[PDB]
Design a protein around this motif. Structure first.
Motif, PDB file in Angstrom:
ATOM      1  N   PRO A 143     -59.192  56.960  84.248  1.00 23.38           N
ATOM      2  CA  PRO A 143     -60.222  56.956  85.291  1.00 23.38           C
ATOM      3  C   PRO A 143     -61.296  58.005  85.038  1.00 23.38           C
ATOM      4  O   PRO A 143     -61.047  59.074  84.481  1.00 23.38           O
ATOM      5  N   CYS A 144     -62.514  57.679  85.467  1.00 25.61           N
ATOM      6  CA  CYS A 144     -63.648  58.575  85.285  1.00 25.61           C
ATOM      7  C   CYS A 144     -64.625  58.425  86.443  1.00 25.61           C
ATOM      8  O   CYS A 144     -64.632  57.416  87.151  1.00 25.61           O
ATOM      9  N   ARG A 145     -65.452  59.448  86.623  1.00 23.41           N
ATOM     10  CA  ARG A 145     -66.589  59.396  87.538  1.00 23.41           C
ATOM     11  C   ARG A 145     -67.621  60.414  87.059  1.00 23.41           C
ATOM     12  O   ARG A 145     -67.552  60.891  85.920  1.00 23.41           O
ATOM     13  N   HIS A 198     -63.928  55.700  91.400  1.00 31.09           N
ATOM     14  CA  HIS A 198     -63.775  55.847  89.959  1.00 31.09           C
ATOM     15  C   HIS A 198     -64.062  54.539  89.237  1.00 31.09           C
ATOM     16  O   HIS A 198     -63.788  53.449  89.748  1.00 31.09           O
ATOM     17  N   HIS A 199     -64.619  54.668  88.035  1.00 30.32           N
ATOM     18  CA  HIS A 199     -64.730  53.580  87.074  1.00 30.32           C
ATOM     19  C   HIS A 199     -63.805  53.877  85.902  1.00 30.32           C
ATOM     20  O   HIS A 199     -63.670  55.032  85.488  1.00 30.32           O
ATOM     21  N   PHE A 200     -63.167  52.839  85.374  1.00 34.95           N
ATOM     22  CA  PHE A 200     -62.035  52.993  84.470  1.00 34.95           C
ATOM     23  C   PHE A 200     -62.419  52.555  83.065  1.00 34.95           C
ATOM     24  O   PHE A 200     -62.888  51.429  82.864  1.00 34.95           O
ATOM     25  N   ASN A 201     -62.217  53.446  82.096  1.00 40.98           N
ATOM     26  CA  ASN A 201     -62.575  53.202  80.708  1.00 40.98           C
ATOM     27  C   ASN A 201     -61.328  53.137  79.835  1.00 40.98           C
ATOM     28  O   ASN A 201     -60.327  53.808  80.100  1.00 40.98           O
ATOM     29  N   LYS A 202     -61.400  52.322  78.786  1.00 41.49           N
ATOM     30  CA  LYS A 202     -60.303  52.148  77.842  1.00 41.49           C
ATOM     31  C   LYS A 202     -60.549  53.003  76.605  1.00 41.49           C
ATOM     32  O   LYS A 202     -61.622  52.929  75.997  1.00 41.49           O
ATOM     33  N   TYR A 206     -61.520  62.033  73.039  1.00 43.99           N
ATOM     34  CA  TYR A 206     -62.508  62.200  74.091  1.00 43.99           C
ATOM     35  C   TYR A 206     -63.116  60.847  74.453  1.00 43.99           C
ATOM     36  O   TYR A 206     -62.792  59.807  73.869  1.00 43.99           O
ATOM     37  N   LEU A 207     -64.009  60.857  75.438  1.00 49.89           N
ATOM     38  CA  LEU A 207     -64.790  59.675  75.756  1.00 49.89           C
ATOM     39  C   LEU A 207     -65.927  59.514  74.751  1.00 49.89           C
ATOM     40  O   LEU A 207     -66.277  60.442  74.017  1.00 49.89           O
ATOM     41  N   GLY A 208     -66.492  58.309  74.713  1.00 46.67           N
ATOM     42  CA  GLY A 208     -67.632  58.071  73.844  1.00 46.67           C
ATOM     43  C   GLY A 208     -68.795  58.975  74.209  1.00 46.67           C
ATOM     44  O   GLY A 208     -69.077  59.216  75.385  1.00 46.67           O
ATOM     45  N   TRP A 264     -73.718  59.822  79.844  1.00 47.17           N
ATOM     46  CA  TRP A 264     -74.107  59.071  81.033  1.00 47.17           C
ATOM     47  C   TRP A 264     -73.344  59.550  82.261  1.00 47.17           C
ATOM     48  O   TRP A 264     -73.931  59.748  83.331  1.00 47.17           O
ATOM     49  N   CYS A 265     -72.037  59.731  82.131  1.00 49.22           N
ATOM     50  CA  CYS A 265     -71.216  60.157  83.259  1.00 49.22           C
ATOM     51  C   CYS A 265     -71.429  61.616  83.658  1.00 49.22           C
ATOM     52  O   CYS A 265     -70.670  62.108  84.503  1.00 49.22           O
ATOM     53  N   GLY A 266     -72.404  62.331  83.119  1.00 49.83           N
ATOM     54  CA  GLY A 266     -72.771  63.632  83.620  1.00 49.83           C
ATOM     55  C   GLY A 266     -72.516  64.804  82.695  1.00 49.83           C
ATOM     56  O   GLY A 266     -72.460  65.943  83.178  1.00 49.83           O
TER      57      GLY A 266
HETATM   58 ZN   LIG Z   1     -67.198  57.314  82.833  1.00 52.65          ZN
END
Ligand SMILES: [Zn+2]
Ligand SMILES: [Zn+2]
Length: 883
Positions: free
Chosen positions: A724-726, A708-712, A835-837, A843-845
């Protein structure tokens, strides 16, 4: 111009029926029906030829135009019949097979032909961009036929331009396909290369009369124009007049089973394991036998006996998730995902390459550095906490029902599940026996079982991915393990409190905060390079370093613990499943004295420990503490402990490692090229050149750790949380898969719920995962209980496996229990959570903005209602979709 050219023009002048008449006329063929049934069925142990090619090479060697041996390399293997025939020959040793494959009818096939254990194949290889390697025998079957001789020439010339680079490195023998040898440019170049490198050109009668394909081989010495124009002549003469009768020959029978290999394994200390060995023999003495064709290099072959087959590969669908994700039917990244092949075949075809290795013995200076750093780490770890023996009651406290039994001996085959066995004092009586023997210095029962893991993974060759090996001991031995070294896990020795670099038990919610804390710390960049196959790379010396903790125990604890280390870790006996010839299946017993098992109790503890040792060592090398000579022998060893006590913690707190995975933040970029000790120990870097500098990162949010890569993310009200994200595709694929064979729809829907609430809990920030998860929980009856297993990570506690509502659990784990959050204000509704950006989500799918997702999203209600109908009406659903 030439005979071949005019023959080709005449062939193109023909029409379909003349084409038919001529193409097969009077050539030799093989009875391919026997095989072509087995191909449809997939009968691996039939031992039949996967393609025609095998007969081609067979004819080439029986007549004696090719004499292959040693390291063989197949170019353009396709199905691989060339390689598969290669395996059979007496003098070959290693067979690697490369081809392009992929879209279109052009893939390989995996079978159990004689000597398959030396056949390492691979797909997706544009060999033109591949650098050459020094073979002992070179093979190439490449060349796409065409109507235009321009093409045949162009390509075949390109093929030769490639293979030259290889041939100049001196192969003992070679065969290369030459589609067009009949043109002037071709004839000339083929004569020039025949002179410069040797061999000769032969046309095979098996080949069809529709091409001028000829093969350039080592053992011949014929002139180009001679055989070429002889072939052209025979083709022309075959054209006119009679359609001559095809001649039928018998296709070659490859046989089946494994091939013998050079046993380079160390001799086992028979005094330790002999009891277990001869006990197993005495139990299975009816069918016990020793196969000469053992496939093991680095393990000590101790025998085999006849047994039945365990596990399978088949992959079942969770129609819940699939029908709720029709727009994802196109992406290969999700469709190719399937179950792991846990058959004996699927295990061994990973074993022979990944597990059958013996690590380069590190030098005495690196050994001394390892022991020094390990001693310092055992010091700094065991300062606050002290060792202790664990009790039966703690074992039964932690135990659950689902745990693995591990039936080995007759005395252990009574019970069915763990909760049953733990409550029977007979079990504990046998435990007391093995304990008395252990204290006496003998081991009668601590034996490892091994098979393939049931994982959800990316499929290879459009087929079942192989299963990595998992091995664990029977319950009693695991209890001995627990009471001896059970505490390191229990007292949280690897916890960030005590360890500093470790993160034992901490969930995926928190770890990104550790990455933020590490990024605020100044220095160079962040480096998180994965160590290739950690379990196999563990060496004797590493185990002897980890055993040094025994000096902090007391006399009984040291006796039991050290006994268990010596008779369990430093000498390992394994029972494994292997598929035998003619379809039967057998159980082999092997041994070794190195590496680690996934089913050792203190797997995570020891892995994390020695990984921290490694990162410390590499930090010393990077910062000029270890000089290049100190691999051979250490100079002024005290300046090791001078550094360790000066900055050890200071650098240890700049680490975040978890078992095999690592994250480091050093002082400067020298860490990117401080590879010498790392490589000497045997801890190579995965999917990277051994000597090329490592890739680092500036922005900590992009750091991959434990997949996982972790976003704020900032809340809509104002507060900040680390999530956490992937990649979406891997998770959607994982959800698609159904582990059990023949499961009623209830439990599959239960899995679908488990995944849904997992995504709500963790990946809420993903628009498609939030949408689809709400769609699952809606379409699934809220009555039913979540069951199954979703991810095998230890950092997922299983907080989504309850009937509770996920807003409250979200508040608990993300606010009420959130240590790094000062304001405890719970959040009222879902739409407050951001939500995420959009760019980062894409990008993350994510598939937002594309018309299939819009169609499926607008008709979500029709489809979900269809799910309700399919399950069955008059069951309690809730309509989670308010927006
Ligand atoms: Zn991500
Ligand atoms: Zn034992």
């Amino acid at each position: 111009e030439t005979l071949g050219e005019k023959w080709k023009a005449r062939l193109n002048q023909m029409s379909a029926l003349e084409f038919y008449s001529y193409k097969k006329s009077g050539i030799t063929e093989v009875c391919r029906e026997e095989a072509r049934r087995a191909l449809k069925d997939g009968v691996a142990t039939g031992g039949h030829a996967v393609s025609r090619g095998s007969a081609k090479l067979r004819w080439l060697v029986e007549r004696g135009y090719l004499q292959p041996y040693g390291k063989v390399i197949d170019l353009g293997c396709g199905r691989g019949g060339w390689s598969y025939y290669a395996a059979t020959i007496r003098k070959v040793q290693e067979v690697k097979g490369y081809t392009k494959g992929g879209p279109g009818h052009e893939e390989p096939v995996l079978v159990q032909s004689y000597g398959w254990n030396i056949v390492r194949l691979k797909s997706g290889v544009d060999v033109f961009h591949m650098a050459a390697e020094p073979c002992d025998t070179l093979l190439c079957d490449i060349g796409e036929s065409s109507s235009s001789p321009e093409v045949e020439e162009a390509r075949t010339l390109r093929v030769l331009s490639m293979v030259g680079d290889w041939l100049e490195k001196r192969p003992g023998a070679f065969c290369i396909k030459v589609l067009c040898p009949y043109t002037s440019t071709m004839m000339e170049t083929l004569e020039r290369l025949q002179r410069r490198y040797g061999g000769g050109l032969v046309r095979v009668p098996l080949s069809r009369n529709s091409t001028h394909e000829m093969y350039w081989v080592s053992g011949a010495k014929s002139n180009t124009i001679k055989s070429v124009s002889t072939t052209s002549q025979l083709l022309l003469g075959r054209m006119d007049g009679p359609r001559r009768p095809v001649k039928y020959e018998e296709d070659v029978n490859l046989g089946s089973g494994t091939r013998a290999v050079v046993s380079c394994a160390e001799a086992p200390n028979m005094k330790i394991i002999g009891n277990r060995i001869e006990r197993i023999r005495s139990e299975h003495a009816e069918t016990w036998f020793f196969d000469e064709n053992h496939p093991y290099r680095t393990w000590a072959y101790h025998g085999s006996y006849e047994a039945p087959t365990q596990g399978s590969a088949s992959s079942l669908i969770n129609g819940v998730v699939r029908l709720l994700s029709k727009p994802w039917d196109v992406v290969t990244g999700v469709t190719g995902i399937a179950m792991t092949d846990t058959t004996p075949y699927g295990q061994q075809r990973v074993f022979k390459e990944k597990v059958d290795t013996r690590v380069p013995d590190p030098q005495e200076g690196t050994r001394q550095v390892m022991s020094m750093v390990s001693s310092w780490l055992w010091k700094e770890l065991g300062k606050h906490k002290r060792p202790r023996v664990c009790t039966k009651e703690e074992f039964i406290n932690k135990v659950r029902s689902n745990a693995a039994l591990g039936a080995i001996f007759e005395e252990e085959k009574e019970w069915k599940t763990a909760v049953e066995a733990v409550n029977d004092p007979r079990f504990w009586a046998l435990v007391d026996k093995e304990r008395e023997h252990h204290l006496r210095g003998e081991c009668q029962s601590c034996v490892y079982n091994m098979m393939g893991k049931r994982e959800k993974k990316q499929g290879e060759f459009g087929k079942a991915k192989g299963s990595r090996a998992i091995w664990y001991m029977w319950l009693g031995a695991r209890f001995l393990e627990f009471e001896a070294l059970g505490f390191l896990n229990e007292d949280h020795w690897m916890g960030r409190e005590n360890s500093g670099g470790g993160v034992e038990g901490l969930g995926l919610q928190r770890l990104g905060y550790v990455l933020e804390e590490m990024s605020r710390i100044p220095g160079g960049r962040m480096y998180a390079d994965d160590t290739a196959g950690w379990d196999t790379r563990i060496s004797r010396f590493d185990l002897e370093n980890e055993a040094l903790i025994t000096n902090q125990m007391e006399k009984g604890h040291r006796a039991l613990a050290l006994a268990i280390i010596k008779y369990t870790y430093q000498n390992k006996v394994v029972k494994v499943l292997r598929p035998a010839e003619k379809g039967k299946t057998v159980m082999d017993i092997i041994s070794r004295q190195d590496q680690r098992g996934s089913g050792q109790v203190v797997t995570y503890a020891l892995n994390t420990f020695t990984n921290l040792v490694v990162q410390l060592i590499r930090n010393m090398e990077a910062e000029e503490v270890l000089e290049m000579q100190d691999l051979w022998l250490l100079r002024r060893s005290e300046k090791v402990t001078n550094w360790l006590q000066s900055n050890g913690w200071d650098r240890l707190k700049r680490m975040a490692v978890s078992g095999d995975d690592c994250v480091v933040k050093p002082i400067d970029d020298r860490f990117a090229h401080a590879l010498r000790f790392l490589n000497d120990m045997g801890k190579v870097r995965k999917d990277t050149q051994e000597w090329k500098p490592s890739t680092g990162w500036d922005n900590w949010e992009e750091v991959p750790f434990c997949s996982h890569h972790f976003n704020k993310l900032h809340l809509k009200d104002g507060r900040s949380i680390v999530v956490p994200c992937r990649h979406q595709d891997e998770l959607i694929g994982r959800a698609r898969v159904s582990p059990g064979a023949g499961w009623s729809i209830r439990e599959t829907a239960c899995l679908a719920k488990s995944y849904a609430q997992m995504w709500q809990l963790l990946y809420f920030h993903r628009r498609d995962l939030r949408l689809m998860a709400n769609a699952i929980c809606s379409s699934v009856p809220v009555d039913w209980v979540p069951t199954g297993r979703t991810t095998w990570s230890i950092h997922g506690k299983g907080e989504w496996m309850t009937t509770e509502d996920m807003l409250v659990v979200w508040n608990r784990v993300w606010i009420e229990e959130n240590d790094h959050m000062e304001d405890k204000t719970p959040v009222t509704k879902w739409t407050d959570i951001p939500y995420l950006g959009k760019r980062e989500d894409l990008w993350c799918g994510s598939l937002i903005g594309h018309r299939p997702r819009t169609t499926w999203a607008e008709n979500i209600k029709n489809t979900v209602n269809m799910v309700r109908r399919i399950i069955g009406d008059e069951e309690k659903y809730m309509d989670y979709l308010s927006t």
